[PDB]
Amino acid sequence: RRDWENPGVTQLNRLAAHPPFASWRNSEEARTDRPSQQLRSLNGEWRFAWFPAPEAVPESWLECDLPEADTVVVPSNWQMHGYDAPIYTNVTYPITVNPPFVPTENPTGCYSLTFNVDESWLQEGQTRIIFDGVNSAFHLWCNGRWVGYGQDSRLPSEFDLSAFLRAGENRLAVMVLRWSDGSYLEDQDMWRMSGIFRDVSLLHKPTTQISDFHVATRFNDDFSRAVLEAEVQMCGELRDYLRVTVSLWQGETQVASGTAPFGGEIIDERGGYADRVTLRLNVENPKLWSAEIPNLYRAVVELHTADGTLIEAEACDVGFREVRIENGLLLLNGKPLLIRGVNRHEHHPLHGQVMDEQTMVQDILLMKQNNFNAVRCSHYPNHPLWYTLCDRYGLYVVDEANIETHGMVPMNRLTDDPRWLPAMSERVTRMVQRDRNHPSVIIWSLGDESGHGANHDALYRWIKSVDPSRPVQYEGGGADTTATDIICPMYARVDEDQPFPAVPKWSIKKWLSLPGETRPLILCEYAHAMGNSLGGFAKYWQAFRQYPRLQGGFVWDWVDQSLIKYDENGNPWSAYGGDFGDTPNDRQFCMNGLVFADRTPHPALTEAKHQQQFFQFRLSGQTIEVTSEYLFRHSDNELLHWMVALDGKPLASGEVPLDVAPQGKQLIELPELPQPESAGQLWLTVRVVQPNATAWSEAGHISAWQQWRLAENLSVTLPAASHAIPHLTTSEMDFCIELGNKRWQFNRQSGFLSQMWIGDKKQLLTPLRDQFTRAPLDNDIGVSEATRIDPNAWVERWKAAGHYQAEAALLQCTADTLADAVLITTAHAWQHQGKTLFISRKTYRIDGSGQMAITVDVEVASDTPHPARIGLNCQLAQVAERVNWLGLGPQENYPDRLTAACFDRWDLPLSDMYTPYVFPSENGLRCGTRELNYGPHQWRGDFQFNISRYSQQQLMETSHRHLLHAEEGTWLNIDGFHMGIGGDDSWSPSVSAEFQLSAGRYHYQLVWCQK
Amino acid sequence: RRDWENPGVTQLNRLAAHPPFASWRNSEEARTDRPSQQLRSLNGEWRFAWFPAPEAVPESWLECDLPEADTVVVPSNWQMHGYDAPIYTNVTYPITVNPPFVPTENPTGCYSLTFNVDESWLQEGQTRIIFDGVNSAFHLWCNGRWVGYGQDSRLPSEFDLSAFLRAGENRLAVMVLRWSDGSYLEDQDMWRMSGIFRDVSLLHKPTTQISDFHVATRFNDDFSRAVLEAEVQMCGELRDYLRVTVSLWQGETQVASGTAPFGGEIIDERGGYADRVTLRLNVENPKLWSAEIPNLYRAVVELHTADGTLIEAEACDVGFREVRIENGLLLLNGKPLLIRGVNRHEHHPLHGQVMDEQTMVQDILLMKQNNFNAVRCSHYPNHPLWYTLCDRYGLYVVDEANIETHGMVPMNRLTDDPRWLPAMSERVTRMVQRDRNHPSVIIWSLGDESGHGANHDALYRWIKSVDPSRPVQYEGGGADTTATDIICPMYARVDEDQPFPAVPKWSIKKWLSLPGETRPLILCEYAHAMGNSLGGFAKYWQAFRQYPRLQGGFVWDWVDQSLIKYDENGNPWSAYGGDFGDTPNDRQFCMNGLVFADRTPHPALTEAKHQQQFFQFRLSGQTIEVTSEYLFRHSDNELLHWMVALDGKPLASGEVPLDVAPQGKQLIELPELPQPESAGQLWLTVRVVQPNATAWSEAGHISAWQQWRLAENLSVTLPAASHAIPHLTTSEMDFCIELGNKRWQFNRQSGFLSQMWIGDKKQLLTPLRDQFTRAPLDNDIGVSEATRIDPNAWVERWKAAGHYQAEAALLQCTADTLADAVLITTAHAWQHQGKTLFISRKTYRIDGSGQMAITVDVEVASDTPHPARIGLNCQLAQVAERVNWLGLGPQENYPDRLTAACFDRWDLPLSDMYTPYVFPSENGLRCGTRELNYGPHQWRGDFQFNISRYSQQQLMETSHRHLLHAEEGTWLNIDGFHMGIGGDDSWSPSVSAEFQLSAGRYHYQLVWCQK
Ligand SMILES: [Mg+2]
Ligand SMILES: [Mg+2]
Ligand SMILES: [Mg+2]
Ligand code: NA
Ligand code: NA
Ligand code: NA
Ligand code: NA
Ligand code: NA
């Protein structure tokens, strides 16, 4: 019998799913959520053995331990131990598509454990084993006898072991198969791994036991009265003395309580459920649950004899909140949500897909620190602890089934096939049966990227029938099918329609108002944070806030899916698809995160925070208007900090308490400002500071900021007339200008400033030449590979037009000596196949004050793909420690991703100006700069720049960040103009038109000097 | 592995479900629906042995035939060969309620066959085996080798035999388990059998094959234009040269054709279905399919090469029809339906649940002959030919899933369990896949009597999503759940509410207008025809006709589920529950038909035929208005015959052809009425006749009738004064009267007429005593038996009051002499435990003409249960040939079942006056009778009566008709008054208040005379 190749069989002898149990026998331990002695952990050291296929496991293995076995940590993924390779493939199945068959060579992993069982446990009561997560299907033996079988990689599989165990020493044997008919529904865009990867545990229940419980909370019209409604189910022999008591606690007060015998209401012509009882507790003025204020009451479900003997107590955290869609909005406790969400995969760089508390918490605090309030379980039910943290710390969660059939042609081929409705139902019902009493789950999802098939309709309805407290969403089949209560497209652009056939991604603003449309829209995936990305983020939030029915989205995604490899020396590095002998593979597409796998944040993460702010600001003369975007909480942990500066020079600053009601407003008057006497632009900068620490933030946390321009007085006063006049010395090869101990050289055969000297030390390593290219970002590149070109990729259009192999061509090199300055005039052309791509017309002016004034006017051929940048580079000899600039910072910014950056005087170490994306590209730019200092040099103007030890050439050549070597000197790029980075998605051009460089003609001017 | 005890395993290696195939290789054979070489029936003499449990089956049966095995016929139920008992159980399971387990004693049938196969089937192609129905689960071997496993007893199981087939002799081996986890979904109110009870066959397909095809027909606003859409699916190797052609035939005329290459439209992001194609044929002015006119087109689906070579062809019948529910109405072709329907179980008194063409055709004719237009497949999908017969003769069909969990407590224990959804979904989905192309199927049913659970919700939505062309219904959980498009209760009375908790059965009229309700109502069952029943039928049809949203129902039900047993003298007799040693059993409850098992009608059938007429009549003076109720046809096969008669004596008649349009009115004026000479009542009669034979009826079929009272001439002339005087001769013991050769003897102690005389021939045996009781009908008894008494039952009310044993207690017996006559005056009182139940006061009068005028006046204690009858009985000495009566008939009628009867002179043999219900009771009543001749006797007046060789004693004491024996002479009951027979259901009192005898005081006079 080949059960792993049969969608008719997804389990054998597996127990019914249910909410989390611990089988407490002291009601007080249950109340306080302390450990229970009836819930043992079996996590630790086990005996592992790898085999190429199930047919190749020795028959002795069932009875005796294998000599060639190893001792390994369970839970784990055997790939993370090196037994075989993890595979990164997005869409295409890692297997031959031949349902329901799998490869014959089926990497098989043979886990065993020798553990001890106390005698008491076996004398009375049921003993079961719980496999929280096994990938992707496994058989189970206990002491040589066969126990059962199970599929689904992401929901617990439970097995009654009462009849199999003995006193003291016992032995498990778990035959985990990598490939199974399960895998056809587990085709998510993520590393393919396997094994026993979540907790293993033993559960001792009484024979007469609580077998299930459902908590429901409904309200009156203003949430001042609530009825908690708990349905309890039991197994065992029914007796009149039996009772369930349900008691609700807020901290340590008991606020409500209900006691009844078993025997539910009459349901039909045969009567009612003898083995169920429903308790109804009235609760005046309940404290409501939200992400803002995550209030939690505690429910204790006691099964006991009426005369007062506790049989067992089970329990859960309860949060009084109401989720519904009325008149086209998604309401929570009456109010319209704004979903500042992120998609988060369960991933660790060392541990693979094995989740731990420390990392989950690290993830949550950062999420909440950067202004998120929601997270999608993409694309499976998470480790059970995760919901508990979301319950407690406060987050809106979308719980999503382990169903993805992305590799199918068409994508619905399995989801429309009735013979797959059994395996799909199991993946939806068992999630619901497991998670339905977690407050943090507000939305149920039917899975991911699996077309639209009658099965989606069937299961959608099943949920709706079983659980009306949570709306049901599903993106498949074009995001607005009959299987979704919410339009939830992935990567639908704000303004631009992408009218694909059958499944068009309409513009979000447009989608809402389609004939007969009324539903709310919350993107399930948007802003594809792969590499240098999130260009266009502000465009969504402006929209989100303007349109009531646009209620947010979920970014793709949270954490880069990189893995650690070690080199010859034992030094660690970050690996992506293909780096494991895995073939085929989608290379670096596993890394679409806001943070690196170690949780160091991409610069993209700051923009998200600033846009996801909970306070909005307007300025009107000398009045700041603060508006709250909170639905429930006041601003009881907020002070407003303001600062006025003349070009980075602090002039004044104050502090005013924020006392803003939810959705309310505060008007703040600033003192009459001192009106400055010297030239420059003023900048007002408000910051919202949280003076007090919280569960999720430190004292002083900045949760919001904003800048404005105030008065500007333009410099009209002249520079002092310097008496000295620079000497031009014309040679055969060079126009050499001199001033004091300062020296310029202009190679006349190339037409560039080829050297400088301060005193007598050389200042340059490469000549100062124009640049109209960049080391391509992931969004420039997209799906394009050497063997499958996408000629519509920005990079591939740039290559074809000859941008990267465009040779300069000298047209003019002239010197003029003036009254008090020497003037150099150059003109250039870049050509590819008899085609002038660009033309650059320059003037250099060196005066008696030793300040070189460069003027650059560039022509761009109207029919060459709009250029990546319009600027200059050189390779200075200088390597300094500090970069000081007056401009946008402190972090990396680009034209279409620069809202979170502030205009000010910044100062940082040189390595902070390099941004270490695993896949190396252009990086570290800061726009809107008026002054740049780097050692002896100063640049003034109005430009964008980056500075590092990495040439654009080395960047575009190198495949991995760790393979980069610090080049000699410092490479500087000073752009007058720079193309946006885009990132609406990352496999089609996504840089919005107003961010592409199409003006045709460009002009920028730089004063270059030494101080 | 015990698969018969696992609802996670419903099949192994079973090929997919599909419409009926034939793999024709000649398009003309396809078009004409002739046999195909490629489909062999394996029905015939198989080998069979029976086993007590699957564990007792020897391993030598897989390779060789067991010598002890008998050669038996297949298809069959092994019960009908008498290998074990058939079990009749209504609600309670035939096994212990222990999901998923069945008993370890599980009757097991070992079928097998040695067969030979064509060389070309061994050479190429797919050869599958198709068991149309195996009850209940089975394993399959071919040539010693294991093939697969199957469940669900009422849909076909198909497996591929290609890899198993050998040269020469092959051997099948089918192990049939009577009980399985499948038994828990098959709990219908019927006989419990098993075996291979439907067709077994071999189908030989090309490798590149048609694997599915869908035929849809949509319409415009007037059905003057129609599109036929045909979705075609294939398996095997696609090649650029393959084509599909869908042609549509009407008689010998192609009407339209569609040819195209495989390649469907873009479905989702990943493309379309390359292995499918959808053909669209435009058809102008189509002939629509209705039960009124079964207009059929023929559809041929050719898989062929573009160069013109045919690979194979499949085909079906097409009826252009649209079924929608709009503004609260079930419309067919845009017209509101009136469902004149019945539930029909697959039953035969010799063969069990095996079906044949001769039986079906018999059933279909009879139903259509008796004014039925719809039928419910109660409660499973039927043998496949049934739908074809329905398509062709024209009946509306409810196709019902094979899911019934009547025995669960509560009824939804399984249907609300997500562990049972897979097993359930197979049973629903696979019916559609099979049956979706039959025009006759207008409604999908989700099963029967299984409560309401989320599984029902899930599958409803699946059907809506998969087949939008058909409304889905289901009675479970209240008859108006979220799971039905039609309010489809069972046994919801017309005017009376029955406010049951959770599942109330409202009065149908009230149900419609329940607040917020809009859906239409059609009873999925009504009018329990159990024994002497169908009383109160006319009340349904009056309401059906008045309320537009009441759109009919299906009677429970067609045929009696009696099974033939033979006696000691080898003589057949009809047997019910417990007659096979089966226990527990629900006795005569398997028998609720309008026809007997042999398809002889019960007398309730003629009532139904009358009430379900298609022409309505009114009389206004001399003007008959004839109204057609037909939705589509004109009366192209009807002529009205009219007839006037003065007390049975023809006065005039005539014919006028009906030329009535559908839903129109014809006014037929009767000629100047011939005014009669004598004294009596004129009665108008009208019979509608079909002169031409049809496919469903002989030439001369009477389809409708109606009577009316016209002018009455009250008799006034005085008796012609005779010159004879009756002489009173009073003795001590008996008041005795003479008159010529006539002699009357009234007893003084009893107080009744004890003996009459004609010469020396005594006329009586049992004296003319009163009667206030009847041998109880099935409706009178209900659910009550000796061990559990139902105190509510009509019978148990009469038993417990004394009605059945109370004795006459004479209060007076006098004899005054009149001038021209003699006058006897009696009084009686009936008592029990000191209570006076009935006082009876009579006055016999004998004049010189021989006429004896009996005048009766009865008192009834207001607080005794209302009695079954008020009248007289005597056992007459003579045994006769004929009965002759002026009054309603000719067939048996009761107060609430006499609309179908007609007033006239009827002459039948004595045995037609006895109705041989398998459970004997009160029978052969004829109401509204004015004259009654039998032998020389004659009873005049206004009364009802029955006349048989069986006493009310023998009938109430015998439980089976076959065990009755004619008694000496003839029992006559003459009733002044009879209570209704009832039957809105058969488990609670259902006799309507207006047919209960409740007045307290009752009068009626008789005249007895020798003619
Ligand atoms: Mg995907
Ligand atoms: Mg089974
Ligand atoms: Mg039933
Ligand atoms: Na909004
Ligand atoms: Na990805
Ligand atoms: Na690179
Ligand atoms: Na009607
Ligand atoms: Na029955």
From Swiss-Prot, chains A, B:
Cofactor(s) required for function per UniProt: Mg(2+); Mn(2+); Na(+)
Keyword Transport found: no
Binding annotation for Na(+): 189, 589, 592
UniProt catalytic activity: Hydrolysis of terminal non-reducing beta-D-galactose residues in beta-D-galactosides
Name of the encoding gene: lacZ
GO BP field: lactose catabolic process
Site positions (Transition state stabilizer): 345, 379
Record carries keyword Transcription regulation: no
UniProt activity-regulation remark: Inhibited by phenylethyl thio-beta-D-galactoside (PETG), isopropyl thio-beta-D-galactoside (IPTG), L-ribose, D-galactonolactone, lactose and 2-amino-D-galactose.
UniProt xrefs under HAMAP family: Beta_gal
Class of this enzyme: hydrolase
Positions with a binding annotation for Mg(2+) 1: 404, 406, 449
NCBIfam families, alphabetized: PRK09525.1 (NF007074)
Reported impact of residue 345 to D/F/L/N: Less stable to heat than wild-type. Causes significant destabilizations of the first transition state
Residues the UniProt record annotates as site (Important for ensuring that an appropriate proportion of lactose is converted to allolactose): 987
Assembly mode: Homotetramer.
Keywords annotated in UniProt: Glycosidase, Hydrolase, Magnesium, Manganese, Metal-binding, Sodium
Impact after mutating residue 782 to A: It forces the apoenzyme to adopt the closed rather than the open conformation. Reduces the binding affinity
Protein name (record): Beta-galactosidase
Taxonomic placement: Bacteria, Pseudomonadati, Pseudomonadota, Gammaproteobacteria, Enterobacterales
Binding, substrate: 90, 189, 449, 525-528, 592, 987
